[PDB]
DNA sequence: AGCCGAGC
DNA sequence: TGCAGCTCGGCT
DNA sequence: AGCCGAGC
DNA sequence: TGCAGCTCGGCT
């Protein structure tokens, strides 16, 4: 009574309570379809209530969080449940307004996750209810869609616990390892009641796995699938002017078959464009408009509906168009979409870091310096070993120092000005300006219930991209602060631990990398061999292009010398004639064909202009130029090709970063 | 005093204190403006300046209900932040001592809707505290640019001045429900004067008469449809975009909106455009007789009046096959396309083959005027057009709603009774099978049947057997109560009869003048003369163009024939010599290009032909094409504009039959 | 205790 | 993912 | 006491 | 136009 969006069952709460089913739906739309297929007749024994968004995992949630959750509370009230009340006997079930809950989600992995979270909720508070068979599901003949969950022993308790307990992270790792190894095996070969154990190990695990596939980036290009689709869509559009972020998101959805809510995409586009300190070392997309600042960690970005973006000039230098011919492009229902990965010229995964949380594993990598990485790549091309690399954030004025393995001290900047004054001109990476102010300087100024005041005043002189705090203290307090350690006292040192460098390798296998050098080496070997493929590809293609022009130059000359005439000949006479004179069928088309009647259209589609003087000359020059182009390319090694790309990238990186310091 | 529960307020440091009157509350249009203001004020500004954002148009408090006024978030917030009190005169300097701020600075977009918000705020103060206006309570303010604007603030700062009773009358003219007539005259003079011209302190009177009036006029320009195509500009931009796009598969509505925004220079929030798209696509009883866009997905139903439409990111649309039959592509060449800053956008109007303004029943609300037209039958209209083409008189027309099973009877000029369907089944039972047009099923249940069942109850039970597109109530009652109901009249008792009155058919005519039309027959005639005239233009245009195409093909065939015969050669000839030779032999510079311009010699249309052109099959194919084009121009010259119109009408009716048949099956 | 971000 | 209210005129 | 819809 | 909360793992 008095709950929004609840369509309570007529007989709910009465004598026929335990004959009533509450349908919990995934969102209002599923609630509407349930309402349509239910009433008028089904209105007596069936209630409907929509849930919007993932629900609280209650199993180890705090008391406050549980007591305040809107969704859990609404279910408790609607059903008549009570905490701590066992439902062991058949007389205690009389207090319930509903006898069954039917879960109705999308028939997809996120749907399974909500099912799971609802199951987890009941199993945690009222396992007794699971033994009577309290939960059903509606899969999308209305009784043939109804499937009953069935508790059948402690192995069902163990499966729900494995999936939803914070204490079972290690077990989930093993769990998913078995799943990933098994599905890898089957890839080389081939391919009414439901226990909770079968749901967890045969359905939920599909979500848990997809969670990893969408949240943990690839080593090769540093992208997750959604990010990859964004770049793919952008490369394809080739926008020469800015696009609304919201419009770009719709375009990605269309062109790359992204099957998810678009606000996620818009947020991802924003993340790819951000360029403040502690975000992207190299943003592949331009933040045209307010995309967020270091004042609020980007949380001050404007709506995707009022900000614009387009490719950075660095994007195609980093992911050259020509390499597209070597990628494996995926398919979504007979539409070709994004590749399994791009193959950038430097390991992008290190340049911009890597943040991802999945199931069993999570990924964290800090930023690394683009020029250092270029230099180490050049070293490895020379046969030398790469230098060790420290994390490095563009425009960060502080220090990052190694403490141990995969652990670092990140320090901002504080200098004593006089005996009453310190100045803070840099905050440690990922410490935001507004947050430092509210959580450090204010308490330092005002004291708290648990800490005394330490400073007498502070003044702000920040810009949008820099930090300047001028802080006043008594001489006494400044002296004490110095003895204690200025950086320490002012919370300007944080540590950075990187013991979860978890990525998908090029084969699609999840792996833990112990050092960044390992990531660099695996990337290097792969990228070097792709320059080999690129060269082979270019030799063939340029070659076919050369053969093409040869046949075209040959026909024009034979034509303007009267050695051949096409005037008023039938198509078949013409084709037989050209064959008999040894003209090759379209070499370029032939060559693309090999990469998986005679065609002389590349000749006869030429304009009449071709026969004129300037056009004969111009055609001969092009033929000769392509011939030299074939030989210039044969002279270049994979390493040469890579070195050209690196040089072009650094040149533009310098121009672009120089212009940022001006702009 | 401090202010506790107003989350988005940034109170001036000195507001509510000794220096209250020296503080300014900046009221902004939206949160974005607030942020820019907060940046502009820096840290210095925080002391004498408060910022509070308003989101959306605010309540017109003049003549508003007491309830509305008491429950409104924005005006109650403004009242709390400033410390105002209803019914208190702020004449002397004593009375001013209970205020937390001395002045309000309004900061809106420098566009028409901004002016409207300023005016509503001004209206709010003028209505409750006229005394405050005399003191100069109200002022206004005209990226990274933000911190710069505020250091030069004084130039951007305008003060409103109260100068006499003419200031009271201007505000009252704009915002009083009692001054609709004066607003009509106000805008009429404005529109007239504007038509002719084509041939530090700011008094309120000048704000109303020189700034707000521009909003009122824009309000009509966007809300009141054109007679010619039955569109308002937002709708027109959508259609224009769809034609340009020419989608062969469904596009998400939200994506379409973004596309319209881009291609047609739509300068407003996209949610309004997505709603317009949904509106153009709807096809439940009482919406469109001919939906130009297809409702692929849940676009709403008669159950809730379309308000049950799914979100625009989960629904799809595309052109109806009928759209280009109604708005033929060839006629695009006769339209005046508009420019928005170098970009070519939608036309001033489209010119459909029947008066679309009557088919889907245009409706809108502006300032001074509003528009309502009911739906009319497409075939009846086609038939009246045919009648007028033969010099006959058009039959009078009754409103007609596609798939409406009830009755529309004419009481008199522009006056109609619209009735649903109710019939006695037995002596305990009536059945309701149609609701009057625009009575929605759920609403009828809630406001009619529910009361009858409950609170002096009249019926005993009722059951529902609706479908998505049909209505069926079966109603149970005692013989005694049914006999009474049936005596008083079943349609009357069950409220299945509504009146439809149409005394405000206001539309922009073809010249962009607002006009009131008294009958649909007037609308139909004025449309008819324009459209017939445009079949004239289309014929002229087509004869010119097809002629140029004929010439073009003549020269091309000629070159080809001459080439395959030896009479001419281009092999190894200089470009310069080749041009000169073609000239000497009297080949014509691109006839099509030349014709288009007419509204050195260019022989590219000859020389860009492929070598394939010289081959046997292509030579015959070219001769065929040349002849056919010649026949096409001759065939068109013989025809009258009426003939062309009749061809389009017949094509339209044939597809309308197919489409509507397939709907009743599907 | 709360951030990180790609989903609902 | 869905939630939140107002203008303006004619009409009921 | 509220619908209709193109705006904020 | 802006408003609302949760998952999952590592780590502060
Ligand atoms: O449910 C969504 C939601 C969704 O179901 C599908 C797509 C979405 O984008 C949302 C959603 O955004 C959402 C809320 N958004 C608040 C802003 N936080 C970051 C959103 O990306 C804020 C709240 C919210 N749902 C509230 C229910 N909370 C679940 C806890 O039991 C949602
Ligand atoms: O302010 C908007 C708004 C806007 O400023 C710009 C664009 C918008 O689409 C809105 C807006 O939709 C809005 C509200 N929408 C509720 C859905 N019903 C109306 C259909 O858009 C519901 C409330 C709302 N504003 C809050 C209430 N302000 C009215 C003053 O009494 C707005
Ligand atoms: Mg789903
Ligand atoms: Mg990043
Ligand atoms: Mg505006
Ligand atoms: Mg309509
Ligand atoms: Mg009113
Ligand atoms: Mg946690």
Which chain A residue shows the shortest CA-CA distance from B311?
A29
β-pairing verdict for B407-412 and B415-419: antiparallel
Name, in order, each residue with C-beta under 8 angstroms of B554's C-beta and a sequence gap of 6 or more.
B626
Domain B224-403+504-538+638-666 sits in CATH at 3.90.199.10
- Nearest-CA distance from B610 to chain A in Å? 4
CA distance linking residue A602 with residue A521, whole number of Å: 45
Strand F near-CB residues (< 7 Å), A 181-240: 211, 215
CA distance linking residue B47 with residue B59, whole number of Å: 30
CA distance linking residue B626 with residue B556, whole number of Å: 9
Residue-wise DSSP of B125-169: HHHH-HHHHHTT-EEEE--TTHHHHTTTGGGSEEEEE--SHHHHH
- The CATH architecture assigned to B404-503 reads 2-Layer Sandwich (3.30)
Task: State whether A612 and B314 contact (CB < 8 Å).
Answer: no
CB of residue A582 inside a 6 A radius of ligand 1: no
3-state secondary structure at position A10 = coil
List the B31 CA – F2 C1' distance (angstroms): 8
**B269-284 residues labelled b (16+ CB within 10 A) or e (exposed):** ebeebbebbbbbbbbb
Residues of A annotated in the binding site for Mg(2+), as ranges? 26, 106, 108
DSSP B352: -
Residue in the block written with tokens 């008028």: A40
Burial of A612 (0-12, 13-18, 19+ CB in 10 A): buried
CA distance linking residue B443 with residue B432, whole number of Å: 14
The pair of structure tokens assigned to B524 is 């139909």
The answer to whether A50 CB sits below 7 Å from nucleic acid chain F is no
Q: Which CB contacts under 8 angstroms, 24+ apart, belong to A587-593?
A: A587/A544, A587/A545, A587/A547, A587/A548, A587/A551, A588/A541, A588/A544, A588/A545, A588/A548, A590/A544, A591/A540, A591/A541, A591/A543, A591/A544
CATH class of the domain whose range is A1-215: alpha beta
DSSP B403: T
CA distance linking residue A114 with residue A143, whole number of Å: 22
| CATH match of B539-637 with 1.10.268.10 | yes
Share in percent of chain B as helix, strand, coil (round to 5): 50, 15, 35
The answer to whether A169 CB sits below 7 Å from nucleic acid chain F is yes
Name, in order, each residue with C-beta under 8 angstroms of A316's C-beta and a sequence gap of 6 or more.
A235
Give the distance, in angstroms, between the CA of residue A564 and the centroid of all CA atoms in the same chain.
59
Compute the residue count for chain A. 663
Asked if B443 and B460 touch (Cβ cutoff 8 Å), the reply is no
CB of residue A52 inside a 6 A radius of ligand 1: yes
Task: State whether B615 and A608 contact (CB < 8 Å).
Answer: no
List the A105 CA – C8 C1' distance (angstroms): 11
β-pairing verdict for A469-472 and A421-426: antiparallel
The pair of structure tokens assigned to A39 is 């009433």
Q: Where are the alpha helices (DSSP H) in A238-352?
A: 245-256, 262-273, 315-318, 348-351
Residue-wise DSSP of B41-101: HTTTGGGTEEEEEE-SPPP--TT--HHHHHH-HHHHHHHHHHT--TT----SSSGGGG-S-
Which chain B residue shows the shortest CA-CA distance from A243?
B262
Give chain B positions within 8 Å (CB) of A607. Answer: 607-611
CB of residue A61 inside a 6 A radius of ligand 1: no
Residue in the block written with tokens 């109603």: B475
Which atom of ligand 1 is least distant from the CA of A54? 29
CA distance linking residue B546 with residue B538, whole number of Å: 12
Centre of ligand 6 from the C-alpha of residue B512, in Å: 22
Domain A216-395+500-534+635-663, CATH among 3.40.50.620, 3.90.199.10, 3.30.1490.100, 3.30.70.20? 3.90.199.10
Size of interface A-B (CB pairs under 8 A): 104
DSSP A365: E
Which atom of ligand 2 is least distant from the CA of B269? 7
Locate the DSSP E strands across B162-267: 201-203, 251-252
Residue in the block written with tokens 């009057």: B436
CATH class of the domain whose range is A535-634: mainly alpha
CA distance linking residue A498 with residue A518, whole number of Å: 14
Using alpha carbons only, what angle is made at residue A529 by residues A528 and A534, rounded to the nearest 5 degrees?
A: 95
Locate the DSSP E strands across B446-546: 461-464, 473-476, 497-501, 505-508, 514-517
3-state secondary structure at position B249 = coil
A239 phi and psi, to 5 degrees? -65, 120
Burial of B125 (0-12, 13-18, 19+ CB in 10 A): buried
> How many C-beta atoms lie closer than 10 Å to residue B652's C-beta?
22
This structure's resolution (Å) is 2.5
Which chain A residue shows the shortest CA-CA distance from B617?
A570
Q: Whose CA is nearest to atom 5 of ligand 2?
A: B56
Task: Identify the H or E element spanning A512.
Answer: strand A510-513
Give chain A positions within 8 Å (CB) of B463. Answer: 40
Burial of A2 (0-12, 13-18, 19+ CB in 10 A): exposed
Nucleotides of F under 7 A from a protein CB: 1-12
List the A361 CA – F10 C1' distance (angstroms): 9
Q: Whose CA is nearest to atom 31 of ligand 2?
A: B58
Centre of ligand 7 from the C-alpha of residue B180, in Å: 12
CA distance linking residue B629 with residue A89, whole number of Å: 90
CA distance linking residue A36 with residue B158, whole number of Å: 58
> Angle at which helices A370-381 and A516-560 pack, to 10 degrees?
70
Residue-wise DSSP of B576-616: HHHHHHHHHTTPPS-HHHHHHHH-----HHHHTSBGGGGSH
Closest CA to A604 of A573, A568, A575, A563: A575
User: What Cα–Cα distance (Å) separates residue A597 from each residue in A543, A545, A584, A586, B94?
Assistant: 22, 20, 11, 11, 101
CB of residue B271 inside a 6 A radius of ligand 2: yes
CA distance linking residue B554 with residue B559, whole number of Å: 9
Nucleotides of C under 7 A from a protein CB: 1, 3-8
Q: Omega before A40 cis (within 30°)?
A: yes
Task: Identify the H or E element spanning A497.
Answer: strand A493-497
Task: Identify the H or E element spanning B185.
Answer: helix B180-197
Locate the DSSP E strands across B435-472: 461-464
CB-closest option in A40, A262, A573 to B313: A262
Closest CA to A25 of A130, A96, A106: A106
Task: State whether B255 and A244 contact (CB < 8 Å).
Answer: no
CB of residue A56 inside a 6 A radius of ligand 1: yes
Task: State whether B611 and A607 contact (CB < 8 Å).
Answer: yes
User: What Cα–Cα distance (Å) separates residue B345 from each residue in B240, B260, B357?
Assistant: 8, 10, 22
The pair of structure tokens assigned to A604 is 């006869």
- Nearest-CA distance from A331 to chain B in Å? 19
**A274-303 residues labelled b (16+ CB within 10 A) or e (exposed):** bbbbbbbbbbbbbbbbbbbbbbebbeebbe
Task: Identify the H or E element spanning B187.
Answer: helix B180-197
The pair of structure tokens assigned to A44 is 């007596």
CB of residue B56 inside a 6 A radius of ligand 2: yes
From B55, B59, B70, B79, mutation site for ligand 2 pocket: most ligand atoms within 8 A of C-beta: B55
CB of residue B59 inside a 6 A radius of ligand 2: yes
Name, in order, each residue with C-beta under 8 angstroms of B73's C-beta and a sequence gap of 6 or more.
none
Task: State whether B607 and A609 contact (CB < 8 Å).
Answer: yes
Closest CA to B60 of B104, B113, B119: B119
Closest CA to A477 of A447, A454, A457, A444: A454
Asked if B345 and B337 touch (Cβ cutoff 8 Å), the reply is yes
End-to-end CA distance of chain A: 60
Q: Is B339 a catalytic residue?
A: no
- Please name the nucleotide lying closest to A105, CA to C1': C8
CB-closest option in B143, B255, B613 to A250: B255
Which chain B residue shows the shortest CA-CA distance from A616?
B572
Centre of ligand 3 from the C-alpha of residue A111, in Å: 6
Residue ranges covered by each domain of chain A: 1-215, 216-395+500-534+635-663, 396-499, 535-634
CA distance linking residue A497 with residue A404, whole number of Å: 9
CA distance linking residue A581 with residue A600, whole number of Å: 12
Domain A396-499 sits in CATH at 3.30.1360.40
Asked if B311 and B343 touch (Cβ cutoff 8 Å), the reply is no
Name, in order, each residue with C-beta under 8 angstroms of B128's C-beta and a sequence gap of 6 or more.
B61, B84, B86
CA distance linking residue B273 with residue B222, whole number of Å: 12
User: What Cα–Cα distance (Å) separates residue A31 from each residue in A12, B296, B601?
Assistant: 18, 20, 70
Ligand nearest to the CA of A393: 4
Centre of ligand 7 from the C-alpha of residue B413, in Å: 25
Name, in order, each residue with C-beta under 8 angstroms of B568's C-beta and a sequence gap of 6 or more.
B559, B562, B581, B585
- Nearest-CA distance from A605 to chain B in Å? 5
Closest CA to A376 of A358, A392, A360, A364: A392
Residue-wise DSSP of B477-498: --HHHHHHHHHH-HHHHTT-EE
The pair of structure tokens assigned to B95 is 């009375």
Residue-wise DSSP of A43-105: GTTEEEEEE-SPPP-GGG--HHHHHH-HHHHHHHHHHT--TT----SSSGGGS-S-SEEEEE-
β-pairing verdict for A413-418 and A421-426: antiparallel
Closest CA to B358 of B328, B379, B331: B379
The answer to whether B313 CB sits below 7 Å from nucleic acid chain D is yes
Of B162, B266, B314, B376, the active-site residue reads: B314
Q: Whose CA is nearest to atom 9 of ligand 2?
A: B271
CA distance linking residue A376 with residue A389, whole number of Å: 9
Locate the DSSP E strands across B366-428: 370-372, 407-412, 415-419, 421-426
Q: Whose CA is nearest to atom 32 of ligand 1?
A: A53
**A570-586 residues labelled b (16+ CB within 10 A) or e (exposed):** eeeebbeebeeeebbbb
Give the sign of the dihedral formed by CA A66, CA A70, CA A72, CA A74.
positive
The pair of structure tokens assigned to A592 is 């693309």
The answer to whether B624 CB sits below 7 Å from nucleic acid chain D is no
Compute the residue count for chain B. 666
The pair of structure tokens assigned to B556 is 């091309």
Give chain A positions within 8 Å (CB) of B575. Answer: 612-614
Give the sign of the dihedral formed by CA B241, CA B243, CA B249, CA B250.
positive
The pair of structure tokens assigned to B545 is 């163009």
Centre of ligand 6 from the C-alpha of residue B408, in Å: 18
Asked if B279 and B273 touch (Cβ cutoff 8 Å), the reply is no
Strand D near-CB residues (< 7 Å), B 152-191: 174-175, 177, 180, 183
Using alpha carbons only, what angle is made at residue A449 by residues A444 and A455, rounded to the nearest 5 degrees?
A: 15
The pair of structure tokens assigned to B213 is 């009036």
Name, in order, each residue with C-beta under 8 angstroms of A524's C-beta and a sequence gap of 6 or more.
A347, A377, A380
Residue in the block written with tokens 């989101």: B55
Which chain A residue shows the shortest CA-CA distance from B465?
A40
Domain B1-223 sits in CATH at 3.40.50.670
Give the sign of the dihedral formed by CA B373, CA B379, CA B383, CA B385.
positive
């Amino acid at each position: 009574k008095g709950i929004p969006k609840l369509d309570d069952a007529n007989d709910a709460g009465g004598k026929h309570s335990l004959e009533c089913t509450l349908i919990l739906t995934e969102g209002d739309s599923a609630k509407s379809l349930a309402v349509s297929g239910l009433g008028v007749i089904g209105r007596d024994r069936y209630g409907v209530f929509p849930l919007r968004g993932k629900i609280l995992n209650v199993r180890e949630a705090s008391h406050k969080q549980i007591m305040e959750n809107a969704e859990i509370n609404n279910i408790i009230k609607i059903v008549g449940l009570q905490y701590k009340k066992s439902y062991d006997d058949a007389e205690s079930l009389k207090t319930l307004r509903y006898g069954k809950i039917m879960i109705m989600t999308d028939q997809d992995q996120d749907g399974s996750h909500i099912k799971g979270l609802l199951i987890n909720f009941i199993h945690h508070n009222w396992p007794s209810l699971l033994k009577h068979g309290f939960l059903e599901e509606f899969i999308t003949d209305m009784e043939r869609h109804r499937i009953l969950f069935r508790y059948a022993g402690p192995e069902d308790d163990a499966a729900i616990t494995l999936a939803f307990s914070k204490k079972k992270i290690d077990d989930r790792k093993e769990w998913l390892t078995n799943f990933m190894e098994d599905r890898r095996q089957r890839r080389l070969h081939g391919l009414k009641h439901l226990t909770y154990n079968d749901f967890i190990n045969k359905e939920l695990i599909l979500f848990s796995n997809s969670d990893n596939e969408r949240s943990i980036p690839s080593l090769v290009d540093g992208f997750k699938p959604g990010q990859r689709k964004v770049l793919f869509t952008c490369f394809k559009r080739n926008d020469k002017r800015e696009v609304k972020v919201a419009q770009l998101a719709g375009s990605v959805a269309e062109m790359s078959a992204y099957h998810h809510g678009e606000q996620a995409l818009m947020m991802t586009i924003v993340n790819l464009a951000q360029n403040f300190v502690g975000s992207n070392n190299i943003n592949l997309l331009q933040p045209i408009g307010q995309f967020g600042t270091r004042l609020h960690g980007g949380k001050d970005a404007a709506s995707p509906r009022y900000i614009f973006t387009m490719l950075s000039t660095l994007a195609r230098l980093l992911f050259p168009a020509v390499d597209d011919n070597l990628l494996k492009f995926l398919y979504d229902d007979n539409q070709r979409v994004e590749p399994e990965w791009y193959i950038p010229i430097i390991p992008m995964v290190l340049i911009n870091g890597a943040e991802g949380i999945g199931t069993g594993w999570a990924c964290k990598l800090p930023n690394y310096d683009a020029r250092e990485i270029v230099n180490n790549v050049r070293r490895m091309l020379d046969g030398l070993d790469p230098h060790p690399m420290l994390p490095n954030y563009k425009n960060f004025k502080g220090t990052i120092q190694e403490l141990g393995q995969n652990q670092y001290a990140v320090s901002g900047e504080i200098f004593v000005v006089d005996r009453n004054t310190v100045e803070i001109t840099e905050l440690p990476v990922r410490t935001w300006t507004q947050v430092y102010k509210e959580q450090v300087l204010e308490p330092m100024l005002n004291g708290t219930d648990k800490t005394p005041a330490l400073i007498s005043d502070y003044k702000e002189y920040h810009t949008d991209t820099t930090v300047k705090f001028v802080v006043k203290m008594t001489e006494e307090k400044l002296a004490q602060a110095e003895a204690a350690g200025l950086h320490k006292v002012f919370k300007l040192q944080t540590t950075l631990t990187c013991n979860s460098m978890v990525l998908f390798d090029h084969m699609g296998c999840l792996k833990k990398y112990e050092t960044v050098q390992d990531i660099l080496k695996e990337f290097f070997d792969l990228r070097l061999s792709y320059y080999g493929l690129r060269k082979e590809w270019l030799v063939g293609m340029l070659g076919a292009e050369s053969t093409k022009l040869n046949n075209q130059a040959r026909f024009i000359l034979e034509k303007i010398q009267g050695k051949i005439t096409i005037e008023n000949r039938s198509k078949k006479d013409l084709i037989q004639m050209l064959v008999q004179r040894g003209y090759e069928s379209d070499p370029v088309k032939a060559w693309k064909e090999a990469q998986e009647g005679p065609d002389f259209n590349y000749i006869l589609n030429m304009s009449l202009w071709s026969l004129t003087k300037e056009k004969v000359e111009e055609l001969i020059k092009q033929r000769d130029a392509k011939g030299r182009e074939v030989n210039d390319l044969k002279r270049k090694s994979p390493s040469d090709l890579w070195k050209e790309d690196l040089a072009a990238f650094v040149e533009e990186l310098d121009k672009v970063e120089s212009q940022e310091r001006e702009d």
